[PDB]
Write a protein that binds this ligand. Structure first.
Ligand SMILES: Cc1cc(NS(=O)(=O)c2ccc(N)cc2)no1
Ligand SMILES: *[C@@H]1O[C@H](CO)[C@@H](O)[C@H](O)[C@H]1NC(C)=O
Ligand code: NA
Ligand code: NA
Lengths: 250, 10, 28
């Protein structure tokens, strides 16, 4: 996260770290949506242009964390993966359309002060909150700058951007399964996700019921925190029928 | 520089 | 899921984090 700040303890208890077993390293962010399901970006697991195709046994998920590099004894919980599910129309060839994946854990994780699931949006919450200017929150352990790394989880609040401005900022084809967020050059505030934050959550606190909803997944960007560029996020609600199908079946 | 995790998880 | 999105150290205790008000103020 660029131009963010240190998270408070328990501020993002759904935040998940995707961790490579060997070499031991941070791969991506992710989020806890139930005691057995974790949501992330498909490109965190499958990206053939870079010879990335992780299997269940390659990875662990670490839940309840605050410190990036410490083993947080008696606080974090480490879970093995039962199965990965990647959206069948995830477009890794072109523009990362439908950049979403689910991971089912081998055993349920125990909730605690530090471990608790985020809600997924219904149609009405999405319609009400996914408006230009409305702010969401991005969290992660990714780099602090495009070109270093944080001691603890970072947090930044960023406004959703009008779709024409998103499109006009890039040569990439933007789809309805994406939205963009970030400040404009003239707005005098900054912030973005960066390397290591992708797959993590973009959340909004509903003013109707005071619950946190995951509206986006950190998907892609052109650099980090560049003037005139924006972060692009998977539109979780638009893909929720797939999420429900996977959980119902499996 | 990640701290080693317990062997049980590996 | 019944309890989703309510943080033990914040909403469950009626404590606010240091920047959630920035979000609320944007929901105009
Ligand atoms: C995919 C993917 C990741 C990546 N770079 S990144 O550093 O992971 C990143 C992701 C989102 C934003 N907003 C900024 C930086 N670019 O494409
Ligand atoms: C990804 O890996 C799976 C499991 O080995 C395999 O079935 C699939 O063909 C791979 N896809 C690639 C390499 O594009
Ligand atoms: Na364009
Ligand atoms: Na920018």
């Amino acid at each position: 996260i660029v131009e963010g700040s240190d998270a408070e303890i328990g501020m993002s208890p759904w935040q998940v770290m995707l961790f490579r077993k060997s070499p031991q390293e941070l791969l991506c962010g992710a989020s806890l949506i139930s005691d057995r399901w974790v949501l992330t970006a498909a490109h965190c697991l499958l990206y053939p242009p870079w010879d990335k195709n992780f299997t269940e046994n390659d990875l662990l998920v670490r839940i309840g964390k605050h410190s990036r590099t410490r083993y947080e004894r008696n606080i974090e919980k480490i879970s093995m993966l039962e199965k990965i599910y990647i959206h069948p129309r995830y477009n890794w060839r072109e523009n990362l359309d439908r950049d979403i994946a689910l991971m089912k854990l081998k055993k349920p994780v125990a909730f605690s002060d530090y471990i608790h699931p985020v809600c997924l949006p219904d149609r009405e919450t999405a319609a009400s909150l996914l408006q230009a200017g409305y702010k969401g929150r991005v969290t992660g352990w990714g780099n602090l700058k495009e070109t270093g790394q944080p001691s603890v989880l970072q947090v930044v609040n960023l406004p959703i951007v009008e779709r024409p401005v998103c499109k006009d900022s890039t040569r990439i084809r933007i789809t309805d399964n994406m939205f963009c967020a970030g400040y404009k050059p003239d707005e005098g505030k900054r912030g973005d996700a960066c390397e290591g934050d992708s797959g993590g959550p973009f959340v909004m606190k509903s003013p109707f019921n005071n619950r946190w909803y995951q509206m986006g997944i950190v998907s892609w960007g052109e650099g980090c925190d560049r003037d005139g560029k924006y972060g692009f996020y998977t539109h979780v609600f638009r893909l929720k029928k797939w999420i429900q199908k996977v959980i119902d079946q499996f | 520089d990640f701290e080693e995790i317990p062997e049980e998880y590996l | 899921e019944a309890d989703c999105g309510l943080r033990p150290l914040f909403e469950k205790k009626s404590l606010e984090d240091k920047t959630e008000r920035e979000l609320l103020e944007s929901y105009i």
